[model samples]
Target: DPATVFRLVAAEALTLTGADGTLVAVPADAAEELVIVEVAGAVPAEVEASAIPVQDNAIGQAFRDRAPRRLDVLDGPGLGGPALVLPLRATDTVAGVLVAVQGSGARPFTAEQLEMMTGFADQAAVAWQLASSQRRMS
Candidate 1:
């Protein structure tokens, strides 16, 4: 249950944003690549299996910098869509990133939506923050 926290958050990202797909990635255990932790909505096989290095690409930048960004194309994931990548934080670590993908033909996400999603990302971190505190308590 502790690890599955992103499932709902990814699902909600799709519903709230009307994204074609939502994928969440976390740092791989002692690995250089960020692994996709959850995939929801209409993700494609190639996109889901897309590997993102911790030091490269937009998604990677989000994780390493703990910042949100918009990409003209999902190059690392190689998706033919626009993507908004946001960092997800926990009490003890940088939790990774939440990526919402829109169809290539669709309009890029607006500033208002980014602001709203930033708030959503913040709230999504609470469970993770609480989980980490509980672990430390034990």
Candidate 2:
């Protein structure tokens, strides 16, 4: 797992949930913001093109919680209908968060799909750790 891990997992999440949009975000070094590292499907350009602060947002909240969270509607009517966020927890630290969403009127996540996404979240965390170690080397 290197830089490739983010994109791979983001794409896999989209496939697993059949969501219309997906994005992978990670902490910006020691900053309070998280940068969008990878994105797929129809994620809003505004979102993928900007940084997310450590509070007041779905992905940010999940990152802070260091747990998985599901939202019926994310951020009012602007974007994200049915969304899921999973923190990439490696050991005692959270490396980042993964977010997947569908249109406003779309169906919610099923139990089985949530289970599978949880597994992927774990895998993403491990890979994120590997990637982190490599980045720290140089």
Candidate 3:
């Protein structure tokens, strides 16, 4: 039952920007911790109002540096384990960061897994760019 629940919540983490170009909705249990930080606006109140600083955490580093980063540990509140963070770009501008975390004791994510996650992030970036264009046209 727990496995199924985890899978279900993990599925939520893959959600892209909506047709209305709103935020991605990630559930609390999706991972040990996950955060999506955009320039601003319409973020669900359920998400913790926190932004990982570029010089501080993996997510911030990925965002500020416009690169993907995989880490052994991310020290912070609710940050428990290994993490894979990637920059989310909409058009030419860096839009945000997507942070996916694993349990503290869990093994480091495999290279293949990290690659796949990067692919997903790339797709998400394209989707976000498209959504932004659509919103502008509307």
Task: Give the number of the best model, judged by lDDT.
Answer: 2
Task: Pull out the clashing pairs in model 2.
Answer: none
Candidate lDDT (C-alpha), each:
0.77, 0.79, 0.48
RMSD of 3: 10.6
Candidate 1, residues 4-123: lDDT per residue as tens digits?
778888889989999888898877663478888788877764455455788757887777777777766784453577888878865557777899987678778888888888888877
Clashes of 1: 0
Order by lDDT, highest first: 2, 1, 3
TM-score of candidate 2 versus the correct structure, residues matched by position: 0.86
lDDT of 3 by residue, 71-121 (tens): 777555224666656566546665455556554675665676667767766
Model 2 residue runs over 4 Å out of place are 76-78, 134-138
Winner of 2 and 3 under lDDT? 2
TM-score of each: 0.86, 0.86, 0.64
Give lDDT tens digits, candidate 2, residues 30-114: 4578888788888865666468888787778788877787778875212558888888778988877888878889888776776
